[PDB]
Design a protein around this nucleic acid. Structure first.
Ligand code: 0G6
Ligand code: NAG
Ligand code: K
Ligand code: NA
Lengths: 28, 249
DNA sequence: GGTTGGTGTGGTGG
């Protein structure tokens, strides 16, 4: 149901330290 | 994990540790896909060339962990296995084709800030995200170099196009595998390594903010070598088998 | 404490 959403990150509107690298690979 | 860094607390709450009962040691990674089901690499359970052949009673899974070695009291959950399910067409003789296995826990695990299932991808999500040059993320407690960490490691790596994967190895690649890693002069490095098998290769969807497990750490030749790439079991391509086992058993 | 208790150094490090 709520797979894939992390309590300490997504659920708290917080980014982990390297996830932006992932999202950049999609858009530079 | 080679050239990664220490995972943050709760960064990978679907990361599972496959732990041998006797001797007491880490065997592999694995991932939490529901409160009762854990996905791993078949080779972590069955690999006759190394005289490896584990039963449900040889193993525990350790869920919620950060430290490699220390018992994280009131944080981790240690679960016994009810049953193990290895893909019937797992090809250990040739090339580890369909390097995939499901493990059914005896009791369901309670989710927590440290324990939370990852999504499995559907056709739409796999088409969209599983593309050369997009990056995913791999996690584990495996070796830091070709031969290790005190805590769970993470590294982010780009998916590599099938031709380059195929040309980088004499092992026969199949559509149930992808490879990932930087090209030799691409500016970064990194890889999974021994001990990271069964750990998840995940990608974050920029459209619904969820993490999807696209791959399972499966195999390589050495670790972090120039011109070589990590290989991963292609979860989406084996998803029908996953669904059949979970629906039946 | 901590990513967590407590006749609290082990049970699993310090
Ligand atoms: C079981 C896993 O920990 C491990 C993951 C290694 C990942 N390596 C890199 N560089 N990302 N897998 C293995 O060790 C598998 C199991 C059997 C042998 N093996 C290998 O990766 C061999 N090095 C290569 C290989 C031999 C036979 C069939 C396929 C691959
Ligand atoms: C693995 O071990 C089981 C017993 O636990 C045995 O039935 C079988 O011979 C083994 N399988 C292989 C492929 O070696
Ligand atoms: K303590
Ligand atoms: Na490489």
């Amino acid at each position: 149901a709520d797979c894939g959403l992390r309590p300490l990150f997504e659920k708290k509107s917080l980014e982990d330290k390297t996830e932006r690298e992932l999202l950049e690979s999609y858009i530079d | 994990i080679v050239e990664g860094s220490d995972a943050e607390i709760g960064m990978s709450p679907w990361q599972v540790m496959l732990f041998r009962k006797s001797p007491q040691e880490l065997l592999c990674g694995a991932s939490l896909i529901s409160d009762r089901w854990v996905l791993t690499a078949a080779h972590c359970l069955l690999y006759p060339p190394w005289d490896k052949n584990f039963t449900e009673n040889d193993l525990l899974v350790r869920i919620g962990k950060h430290s490699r070695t220390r018992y994280e009291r009131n944080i981790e959950k240690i679960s016994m296995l009810e049953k193990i399910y290895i893909h019937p067409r797992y090809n250990w003789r040739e090339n580890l084709d369909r390097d995939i296995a499901l493990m059914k826990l005896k009791k369901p695990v309670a989710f927590s800030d440290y324990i939370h299932p990852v999504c499995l991808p559907d056709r739409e999500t796999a088409a969209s995200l599983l593309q050369a040059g997009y990056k995913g993320r791999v996690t584990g407690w495996g070796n830091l170099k070709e031969t290790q960490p005190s805590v769970l490691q993470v590294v982010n790596l780009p998916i590599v196009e099938r031709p380059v994967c195929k040309d980088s190895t004499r092992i026969r690649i199949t559509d149930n595998m992808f490879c990932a890693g930087y090209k030799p002069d691409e500016g970064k490095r990194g890889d999974a390594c021994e001990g990271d098998s069964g750990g998840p290769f995940v990608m974050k969807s920029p459209f619904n903010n969820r993490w999807y497990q696209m791959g399972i750490v499966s195999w390589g030749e050495g670790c972090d070598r120039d011109g070589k790439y990590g290989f991963y079991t292609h979860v989406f391509r084996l998803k029908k088998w996953i669904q059949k086992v979970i629906d039946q058993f």
